[PDB]
Amino acid sequence: FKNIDGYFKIYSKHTPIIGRDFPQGFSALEPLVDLPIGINITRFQTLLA
């Protein structure tokens, strides 16, 4: 994520990788959405299930 001059960006790539942990092999990162939010953001939390 980043919000330079607004425009929140979400780049994503899904792969059922080996699944041990954060892997080492390189992978590109394709964008999904591009939305010009135009607001102020400073923190980051997350919801659960």
Added chain:
Amino acid sequence: TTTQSYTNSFTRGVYYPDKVFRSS
């Protein structure tokens, strides 16, 4: 409650800066 383990990012986190196709 969650853990705060630290790991090395390795080589990762490179996206497409723009919408412009390229090759070679």
Added chain:
Amino acid sequence: EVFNATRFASVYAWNRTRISNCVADYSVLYNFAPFFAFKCYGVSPTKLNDLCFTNVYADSFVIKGNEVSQIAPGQTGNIADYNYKLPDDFTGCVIAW
């Protein structure tokens, strides 16, 4: 010298001390007196030491509590229309202690 006189002339003699070739040291303006009205309209009361002016006009008055709040742009009363009128486009600060 202008905030520590003994016979500050009242509203009928506005008693202005013109300011030129000075230094705008406003620390005295902060630490001096507990103050009762520190309203600033055209110039910020903290982002003002970075501004350089050609001339500055300071009028020393003696009034009551109601007149202290009465002194303001676009106001009417016994002191805001008959003795000393504050211009609508006035940019500056007021001091009341």
Added chain:
Amino acid sequence: NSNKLDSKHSGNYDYWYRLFRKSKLKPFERDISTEIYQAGNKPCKGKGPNCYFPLQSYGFRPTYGVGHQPYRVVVLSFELLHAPATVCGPKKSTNLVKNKCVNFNFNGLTGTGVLTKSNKKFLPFQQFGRDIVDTTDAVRDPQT
């Protein structure tokens, strides 16, 4: 100048503007907040000495000056970059012709050249395309 919407008899001070901010404003960042501006030293959760309200009323009361009238200002921010366009003007829809030297004005990108179906791998979000040296090489058809 908007004198017929921001002025009325006996004055009108509905509008507001800020002069007291803890720092300079970064571009296109809104700082709307009624947090009492205490410079001072003390907390000053409320109003009073050296701890004042951050925004004052513009005082747009009828007319008191040609340079003090109620001007309505609106800014239009375009983004002239290589990205899929949304707004245009008048449009002509001349049918695409390939294997011929034509003047093209594809989505605001004007130029002259020859077009042909290619075997590139444009990702659905890719619009303009390029070559080794930073020049428009292959533009995918937005329709077909």
